[PDB]
Design a protein around this ligand. Structure first.
Ligand SMILES: Nc1ncnc2c1ncn2[C@@H]1O[C@H](COP(=O)(O)OP(=O)(O)OP(=O)(O)O)[C@@H](O)[C@H]1O
Ligand SMILES: [Mg+2]
Lengths: 140, 441, 30, 76, 32, 290, 176
C-alpha cells in the first residue's frame, strides 16, 4: 500500500471553538455537532516554557472540595497528582473541580476565568457520554 | 355635472370596503381604463388588490378585468398570474372572444401556465371556423408571449391569415407573435402584409410590425414606414426605440422616419436617461449606427456605452451551451489558422479574446496588421424556428454595429457548424466563412 | 422581527422535510 | 518514471511535459519517461517517480480549489 | 422626512445580499 | 459602489436596490464618465465561482419579493409562485432547471464509466427513494450478468439495465418516453410539437408539485412553530423575543464598517419609519411620495 | 407587460355588471361616448381608438410596500390565518363566569373547585397568548432564513426533486 507523507508534524485545532465540543484524541469532533468553527491548528508537542517564562504560583485555584481547598491547596499553574486506587473518587474530585470552575466563572470578571479541559485516556465510551450529560446538565 | 376626481373618489371609496365582489372590481378596473388614470397608481393598486382577493369569477367580469389590465398599461405579476385559475376553470364556459381576451392578456403579462395555453390551443385548432382572425391573432399573441413554441396554432393561424382578409392591428399582432416565436415563414408573412394598405389608425400597430419585420428580417414595406413617418407622436420612447430598431434591422433606407423617431426618444433620454432599459439603449445604438441618423452629443455616446454594457451582460448570462459552441468555434478557428497540437490551440483561444473599443469582450478577435476580423456564433436562440433556420435580425444588427468599429464579422451558424462530423471540416467552414468577408485573413 | 443573516448555499436537492402535525388543537379541545 | 494523463499526448504536449518534469529532478538527469492514459484526470499530468508523486492534474486542482473555497467561507 | 419614495420602499429589507458581498469581495480577491 | 461585474448582472434583474444602482450607474455615465473595460481574465474556476456569488446577489433579494402561496385554493397560486421563481432564475443567469440540473449531472459525472458511480455521485441531486430504486435494478442486472454494468450506452448490459430503469421511471409517475422525445426530438416539427405539448405538461405538473411540496413544508413549519409558541405565557414570549431582538441588534452593531451591518441598521430604521407612517394615518397605509 | 399591446375600443366592455357603478359606451365607427356613473357622481368624456393604444406606453408597474418583505408578509399572513383558526376554537369555550357564585362554591367539592379555578386561569393564559398578535412578526422571521437558504441552491431557485428525477431519467436513459 502507498503511504503519502503530509509534510507536517501532528497538530490539533486549538481556539475558543473547541469549548463545548467533545473531540477525540486528534482534535476531530465526535459529538455530532458539525465541524469545528473558530479554531486554528497548533502542534501537540510544544516545548515547555522555561525559567524566565515562569512566575511564582500565588493565586489560588478553588476545587470546591473543602478537603482539597483547606488542607491540600491548589494554585493556578500547579501540577497536582490525584493518586489512589480504583473507585475511590479521583474522577469525582476532578469533575467537582470543573463544576466549581463553572460556578466561580459567573461571579468573576473576564480575566480570572478558568477554562477546563478534560482528557479521557482509555476510558469506556459510555462513561464519557455520562460526563457530557452531567456537564450539559450542570452547565459546565 | 362633470367632475372626474369625483367619480375617482367614489371608486376609491368603493374598492376600500371588505366585501367587494368580482363584478364591481371588474367594473372599477374598466372605469379606470376608460378615464386615463395612469397618474394615480394607488387607485390601480386598490383595484388590483380587490381583484386578486375575489374568489368566484364569471366569464364576463374576468374578461373585463383582463381587458382592463391589458389595455390600461398596468402589470403586477402576482395578481395577474393568480387569475389563471379562474381562466382554466371557466375555459369550457368562455366564448371565443372572451377566450381570446383572456389568453391575450395572460400571455402579454408573461404568465407561465402551460396547461392554460395547451387547453386553449386545442380548442382553437379544433374549432377555428367560428374564430374571427383578430381572435386567432389574440390567442397566437398569448401563446407566443406566454413562453410556448406552439407551431400547430401557428400553422392554423397562417391558414386563416392567408385565406381571409384581416385588419391592420390583427396582422400587426400576428406579426409580433410570430416575431416572438421566431418562425418567419414566407407564405404566412406576405399573406399578413397585404392588409397594410389602408393606413394604420394607431402607430402601435406600425411600430410592432416594424419590430417584427426587423427581427424576422424580410425587408421594409414603404407603407409601415409612412405610418412611422407621420404618426411618430403616438409612441412611448420605449416604443419608438423598438420601432426605429426594427426599421434599421429591416433595411429601411427612409432616414426621415429615423429622424422623427430619434426626435421622440432623445428628449426623453436627455430629460431622464433612467426611463429605458439598457436593452432599449442598445437597440437605439443599433438604430443610430445602421441608419446613420445623428443623435445628440450626450445621447450617442450614452447609447454606445450602453450597447457594450448590454452585449457584455448577454455574454455573462450566456446560455452555457452557447459557451461550449463559442469554445468549439474558437478551437476550430485556431485549427483553421494552423494548430496541429493542443497547447497551440489553447494559446490561440486564450489570445482571441481581446477587448472591443467600447469596453465589451469579443470572443474571437483576430488581428493581422491593422485589419480586424470577428467570428460570431449563433447557436439556437438566435435562429428561426423553422427548418431553414437562418439567423435572426439581432445578430445581423450585431454584425452591422461591429462592422462600424472595424470588425469584419464572419457569422457561424450552429445548424451548419457542429452537424459536421470532424474538427477539420469545422476549421474549413470557419476559414471559408472568414474568407467570404475578408480574403486577407 | 429580526432574522439572523446567513450566507450559505444548498448543494443538494432534497424533499423539503415536512414537519409532523402539532398536537395543539386536540389538546385545546381536551 | 511513469506519467498518467487524460488524453494520448501530442508531440508538442510531450516535449512541454518534459520541460516541467525536469524541474522535479534536482540534477541534470534526463529521464526515461513513459506514458499512460486514464481520463478520470480532467487533463494535466501525474508524474510517478517510483518514490514521489507530483499530481499536477486539473482533477486534483479543482478539488484543492473546492477545499480552498470551502474553508474561507467558514471563516469569512 | 416622511413620504420617502417608491423605488426605495420596494427594497426587501432583511434579505442577505451583503454577507454575499462580504464573502465575494473577500473570496475572489483571495482566491485569485 | 459596484465593481462593474455586479452592475452587469443587475441589468436584467427587477429588484429595487439593483435597479437603483443600475440607474445611478448610467446616470453617472451620462454626465461624462467612461465605462470600464471588463476583465478578459480569471479562468473558469474563478469565473464559475464569481458567477455563483453574483447570481446569489440576484436570487437573494428576489426571493424575498416573492409571496408564498400559503393556504390557498387551487393550483394557480402555486403556478404563480413557481413562475416567479422561474423568472427569478432567468434574471439571475440560470437557464431552465431541467437544463441546469442536467448540466449538473454532466458536470459531476464526466468521468464515471460505471453505473454504480454515476448513481453514487449524483446521490445528492436525486431523491433517495429513487436512488434506492435505481440501485435495486442495478444490483438486479449485475446479479443477472455477474459483471459490472458500464456507463457506455452501447454495452448490452447497459441496455438491459435501462430496460428496467425506464420501467421504474414510468412506475414513478413520469413519462420517460415524452422526456426523451423532447430532449432528442424528431425531424418533422409537427411531431416535435406533439411531444413538446406532453413534455411541458409533465414539466408543469412536476415543478408545481415540487413548489407545492415546498409550500406544504413551510406551512407545516409555521404551524409547528405557532403551536409551540401558543403554549407559552405572554411574559415568556415577550422576554424571549426581546432577548432575540437585543441579540440580533448586538450582533449587527458590534461589527461596524461592514456594509451588511449598516444596511441592517438602515433596514431597522426603515421598519421604524414604516411603523411611524402607519401610525400617522392607518387608513392610508404608509406614506408613498408620488 | 410587453412593449406594444393591441387592445382598446374593439371587443371592449360595453356595459357594467354591478349596481354600485354603471357604465355605457357608444360603439361608433371611430370614437366612443363613455358614460360612467358610480352611485351619485357621474362623469363623461370622449376617448378614441387611437387614444386607448397610447395608454399602454408608460407602464404602471404596481409594486408592494411591505414592512419587511413580501415573503415575510406572506409567512406572517399565514401565521395570522392560523392564529384565527386557534382563536375560533377559543371562541366556543364554555362560560365559566356563570358558575362563580357562592351557591356554586359551597355546593362543590374543594378539589373540583380548585380544578375549576385553574381551568379558568388556563383559559385566561390561552386567550392572552393567542391574541399576542405582535409576536407573529417575530415568529415569521424564523421561517424566513431556512427557506431562503433552500432557495440559494447551486442549481436553481426553483429546482425540485421531481424535476431532478425526470432529468436524471433523461441523463441515464440516453447514451453516456
Ligand atoms: N464525595 C463522594 N460522595 C459520595 N460518593 C462518591 C464521592 N466520590 C465518589 N463517589 C462514588 O464513588 C464511585 C467511584 O467514583 P470515581 O469514578 O470518581 O472514582 P475513580 O477512582 O475515578 O473510579 P475508576 O477508577 O473506576 O474510574 C462513584 O460511583 C461515585 O458515585
Ligand atoms: Mg475514572
Amino acid at each position: 500500500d502507498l503511504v503519502y507523507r503530509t509534510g507536517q508534524i501532528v497538530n490539533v485545532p486549538i481556539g475558543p471553538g473547541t469549548l463545548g465540543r467533545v473531540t477525540d484524541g486528534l482534535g476531530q469532533p465526535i459529538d455530532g455537532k458539525g465541524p469545528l468553527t473558530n479554531v486554528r491548528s497548533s502542534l501537540v508537542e510544544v516545548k515547555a516554557p522555561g525559567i524566565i517564562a515562569r512566575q511564582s504560583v500565588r493565586e489560588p485555584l478553588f476545587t470546591g472540595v473543602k478537603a482539597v481547598d483547606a488542607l491540600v491547596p491548589i494554585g493556578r499553574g500547579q501540577r497536582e497528582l490525584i493518586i489512589g486506587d480504583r473507585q475511590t473518587g479521583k474522577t469525582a474530585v476532578a469533575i467537582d473541580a470543573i463544576i466549581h470552575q463553572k460556578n466561580c466563572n459567573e461571579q468573576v470578571p473576564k480575566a480570572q476565568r478558568v477554562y477546563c479541559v478534560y482528557v479521557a485516556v482509555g476510558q469506556k465510551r459510555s462513561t464519557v457520554a455520562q460526563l457530557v450529560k452531567l456537564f450539559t446538565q450542570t452547565g459546565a | 355635472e362633470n367632475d372626474v376626481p369625483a367619480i375617482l373618489k367614489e371608486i376609491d371609496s368603493l374598492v376600500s370596503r371588505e366585501a367587494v365582489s368580482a363584478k364591481e372590481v371588474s367594473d372599477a378596473a374598466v372605469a379606470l381604463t376608460y378615464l386615463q388614470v395612469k397618474a394615480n397608481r394607488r387607485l390601480w393598486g386598490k383595484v388590483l388588490e380587490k381583484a386578486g382577493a375575489a374568489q368566484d369569477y364569471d366569464a364576463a367580469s374576468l374578461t373585463n378585468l383582463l381587458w382592463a389590465i391589458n389595455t390600461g398599461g398596468v402589470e403586477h405579476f402576482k395578481t395577474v398570474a393568480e387569475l389563471a385559475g379562474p381562466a382554466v376553470s371557466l375555459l369550457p364556459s368562455l366564448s371565443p372572444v372572451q377566450l381570446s381576451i383572456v389568453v391575450e392578456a395572460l400571455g402579454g403579462a408573461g404568465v407561465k401556465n402551460y396547461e392554460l395555453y395547451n387547453k386553449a390551443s386545442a380548442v382553437v385548432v379544433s374549432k377555428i371556423g367560428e374564430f374571427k382572425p383578430a381572435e386567432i391573432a389574440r390567442v397566437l399573441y398569448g401563446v407566443a408571449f406566454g413562453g410556448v413554441n406552439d407551431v400547430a396554432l401557428a400553422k392554423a393561424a397562417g391558414k386563416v391569415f392567408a385565406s381571409t382578409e384581416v385588419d391592420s392591428r390583427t396582422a400587426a399582432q400576428a406579426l409580433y407573435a410570430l416575431a416572438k416565436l421566431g418562425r418567419a415563414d414566407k407564405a404566412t408573412v406576405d399573406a399578413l402584409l397585404k392588409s397594410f394598405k389602408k393606413g394604420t389608425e394607431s402607430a402601435s400597430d406600425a411600430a410592432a410590425a416594424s419590430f417584427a419585420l426587423g427581427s424576422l428580417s424580410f425587408k421594409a414595406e414603404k407603407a409601415i414606414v409612412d405610418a412611422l413617418k407621420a404618426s411618430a407622436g403616438d409612441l412611448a420612447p420605449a416604443q419608438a426605440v423598438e420601432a426605429a430598431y426594427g426599421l434599421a434591422l429591416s433595411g429601411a433606407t427612409d432616414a426621415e422616419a429615423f429622424k422623427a423617431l430619434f426626435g421622440v426618444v432623445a428628449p426623453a433620454i436627455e430629460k431622464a436617461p433612467d426611463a429605458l432599459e439598457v436593452s432599449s439603449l442598445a437597440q437605439l445604438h443599433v438604430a443610430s449606427t445602421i441608419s446613420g441618423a445623428k443623435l445628440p452629443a450626450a445621447v450617442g455616446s450614452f447609447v454606445a456605452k450602453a450597447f457594450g454594457l448590454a452585449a457584455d451582460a448577454a455574454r455573462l448570462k450566456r446560455s452555457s451551451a452557447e459557451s461550449a459552441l463559442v469554445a468549439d468555434v474558437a478551437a476550430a478557428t485556431a485549427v483553421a489558422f494552423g494548430a496541429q497540437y493542443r497547447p497551440e490551440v489553447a494559446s490561440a483561444v486564450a489570445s482571441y479574446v481581446k477587448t472591443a473599443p467600447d469596453g465589451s469582450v469579443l470572443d474571437i478577435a483576430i488581428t493581422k496588421g491593422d485589419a480586424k476580423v470577428l467570428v460570431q456564433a449563433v447557436p439556437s436562440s438566435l435562429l428561426t424556428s423553422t427548418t431553414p433556420a437562418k439567423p435572426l435580425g439581432h445578430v445581423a444588427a450585431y454584425s452591422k454595429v461591429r462592422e462600424a468599429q472595424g470588425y469584419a464579422v464572419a457569422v457561424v451558424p450552429a445548424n451548419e457548424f457542429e452537424a459536421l462530423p470532424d474538427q477539420k471540416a469545422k476549421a474549413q467552414y470557419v476559414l471559408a466563412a472568414i474568407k467570404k468577408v475578408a480574403p486577407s485573413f | 422581527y429580526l432574522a439572523p443573516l446567513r450566507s450559505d448555499f444548498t448543494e443538494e436537492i432534497t424533499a423539503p422535510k415536512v414537519a409532523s402535525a402539532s398536537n395543539l388543537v386536540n389538546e385545546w379541545n381536551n | 518514471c511513469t506519467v498518467i494523463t487524460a488524453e494520448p499526448l501530442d508531440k508538442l504536449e510531450r516535449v512541454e511535459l518534459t520541460k516541467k518534469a525536469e524541474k522535479f529532478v534536482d540534477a541534470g538527469f534526463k529521464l526515461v519517461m513513459q506514458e499512460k492514459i486514464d481520463k478520470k484526470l480532467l487533463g494535466g499530468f501525474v508524474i510517478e517517480f517510483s518514490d514521489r508523486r507530483v499530481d499536477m492534474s486539473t482533477a486534483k486542482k479543482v478539488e484543492e480549489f473546492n477545499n480552498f473555497v470551502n474553508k474561507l467561507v467558514l471563516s469569512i | 422626512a416622511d413620504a420617502k419614495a417608491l423605488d426605495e420602499l420596494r427594497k426587501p429589507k432583511f434579505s442577505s445580499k451583503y454577507l454575499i458581498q462580504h464573502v465575494s469581495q473577500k473570496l475572489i480577491p483571495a482566491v485569485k | 459602489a459596484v465593481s462593474k461585474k455586479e452592475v452587469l448582472y443587475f441589468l436584467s434583474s427587477k429588484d429595487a436596490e439593483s435597479s437603483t444602482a443600475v440607474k445611478s450607474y448610467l446616470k453617472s455615465l451620462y454626465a461624462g464618465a467612461q465605462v470600464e473595460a471588463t476583465e478578459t481574465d480569471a479562468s473558469e474556476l474563478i469565473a464559475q465561482l464569481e458567477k455563483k456569488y453574483l447570481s446569489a446577489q440576484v436570487v437573494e433579494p428576489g426571493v424575498h419579493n416573492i409571496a408564498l402561496p400559503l393556504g390557498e385554493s387551487g393550483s394557480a397560486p402555486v403556478k404563480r409562485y413557481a413562475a416567479e421563481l422561474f423568472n427569478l432564475g432567468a434574471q439571475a443567469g440560470f437557464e431552465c432547471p431541467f437544463i441546469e440540473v442536467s448540466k449538473k449531472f454532466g458536470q459531476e459525472t464526466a468521468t464515471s464509466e460505471t453505473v454504480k458511480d454515476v448513481l453514487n455521485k449524483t446521490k445528492s441531486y436525486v431523491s433517495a427513494d429513487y436512488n434506492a430504486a435505481l440501485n435495486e435494478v442495478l444490483s438486479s442486472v449485475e446479479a443477472e450478468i455477474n459483471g459490472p454494468v458500464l456507463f457506455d450506452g452501447k454495452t448490452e448490459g447497459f441496455k438491459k439495465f435501462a430496460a428496467k430503469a425506464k420501467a421504474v421511471a414510468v412506475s414513478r409517475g413520469l413519462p420517460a418516453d415524452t422526456i426523451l422525445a423532447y430532449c432528442a426530438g424528431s425531424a418533422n416539427e409537427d411531431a416535435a410539437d406533439k411531444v413538446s405539448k406532453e413534455f411541458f405538461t409533465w414539466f408543469e405538473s412536476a415543478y408545481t408539485a415540487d413548489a407545492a411540496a415546498e409550500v406544504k413544508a413551510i406551512e407545516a413549519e409555521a404551524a409547528s412553530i405557532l403551536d409551540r409558541h401558543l403554549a407559552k405565557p405572554v411574559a415568556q414570549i415577550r422576554k424571549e423575543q426581546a432577548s432575540a431582538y437585543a441579540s440580533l441588534l448586538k450582533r449587527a452593531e458590534t461589527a461596524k464598517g461592514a456594509k451588511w451591518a449598516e444596511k441592517y441598521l438602515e433596514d431597522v430604521k426603515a421598519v421604524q419609519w414604516f411603523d411611524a407612517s402607519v401610525a400617522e394615518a392607518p387608513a392610508s397605509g404608509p406614506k408613498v411620495a408620488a | 407587460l410587453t412593449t406594444f399591446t393591441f387592445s382598446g375600443l374593439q371587443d371592449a366592455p360595453v356595459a357594467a355588471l354591478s349596481g354600485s357603478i354603471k357604465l355605457n359606451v357608444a360603439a361608433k365607427a371611430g370614437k366612443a361616448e363613455v358614460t360612467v356613473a358610480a352611485g351619485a357622481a357621474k362623469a363623461a368624456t370622449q376617448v378614441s381608438a387611437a387614444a386607448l393604444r397610447k395608454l399602454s406606453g408608460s407602464k404602471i408597474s404596481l409594486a408592494e410596500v411591505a414592512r419587511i418583505s413580501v415573503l415575510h408578509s406572506s409567512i406572517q399572513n399565514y401565521l395570522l390565518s392560523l392564529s384565527n383558526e386557534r382563536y375560533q376554537l377559543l371562541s366556543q369555550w364554555p362560560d365559566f363566569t356563570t358558575m362563580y357564585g357562592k351557591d356554586f362554591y359551597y355546593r362543590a367539592h374543594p378539589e373540583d373547585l380548585k380544578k375549576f379555578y385553574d381551568a379558568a386561569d388556563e383559559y385566561y393564559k390561552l386567550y392572552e397568548t393567542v391574541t399576542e398578535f405582535d409576536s407573529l412578526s417575530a415568529l415569521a422571521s424564523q421561517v424566513v432564513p431556512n427557506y431562503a437558504a433552500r432557495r440559494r441552491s447551486t442549481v436553481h431557485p426553483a429546482i425540485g426533486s421531481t424535476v431532478a428525477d425526470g432529468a436524471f431519467t433523461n441523463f441515464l436513459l440516453s447514451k453516456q
